[PDB]
Amino acid sequence: EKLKEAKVKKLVVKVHMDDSSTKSLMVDERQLARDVLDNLFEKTHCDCNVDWCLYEIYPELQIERVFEDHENVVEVLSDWTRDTENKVLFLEKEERYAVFKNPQNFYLNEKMNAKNKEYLLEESFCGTSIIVPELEGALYLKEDGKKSWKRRYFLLRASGIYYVPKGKTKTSRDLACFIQFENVNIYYGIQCKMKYKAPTDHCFVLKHPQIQKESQYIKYLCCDDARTLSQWVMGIRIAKYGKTLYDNYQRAVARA
Secondary structure (H helix, E strand, O other): OOOOOOOOOEEEEEEEEOOOOEEEEEEEOOOEHHHHHHHHHHHHOOOOOOOEEEEEEEOOOOEEEEOOOOOEHHHHHOOOOOOOOOEEEEEEOOOOOHHHHOHHHOOOOOOOOHHHHHHHHHHHHOOOOOOOOOOEEEEEEEOOOOOOEEEEEEEEOOOEEEEOOOOOOOOHHHOEEEEEOOOOEEEEEOOHHHHOOOOOOOEEEEEOOOOOOOOOOOEEEEOOOHHHHHHHHHHHHHHHHOHHHHHHHHHHHHHO
């Protein structure tokens, strides 16, 4: 009905570098992380390897995550409060495309060379639907609004995280949905052992992007070890982003 005589929105984004220096970029509302990364590659003449990424820190909630390359940056940043301590960092995070470098570490003509790694990825990502890693095991889930944690068995599925309720079978029928991936972003939890008395500091966090302070809707999961955390974080990102993640990886290689 109406005409769009509006101006394309432009945001000054302060990107923090690993040496503590900053670069102020003009980021318009159409620009993906991919584009801000391309810009930073040109402005820094770095080596352009696939581990370079935008990373958001949440100093209050003590959580951090990688931006995926297809994410709209203005869209992400417009969730932050006026008085926010949150920072966008430009750094290397080699775990971001770990499944793509080493698919055998997540899915479990014989030697696992580049070619067989490629076959595995194509089967897993390039088919009609994505094959999510066969992932299941126990995790510690923080109780809502308590400094206490419950062990429960969880299972990774293409759409979400499932679990067996306390006193139910391991079979298909007994499973209930804990969380859906449409709703949440996945993050690293930092110092949850200290702040929330977590059994370990291998912690991941599940949170709607919009949430900016302490709430029960923020879910805290604690893993037995680093390898477990890695599995869950990689696996969830695969389930959430699917083929887009593969596309992101390929796109990154093209720049290296």
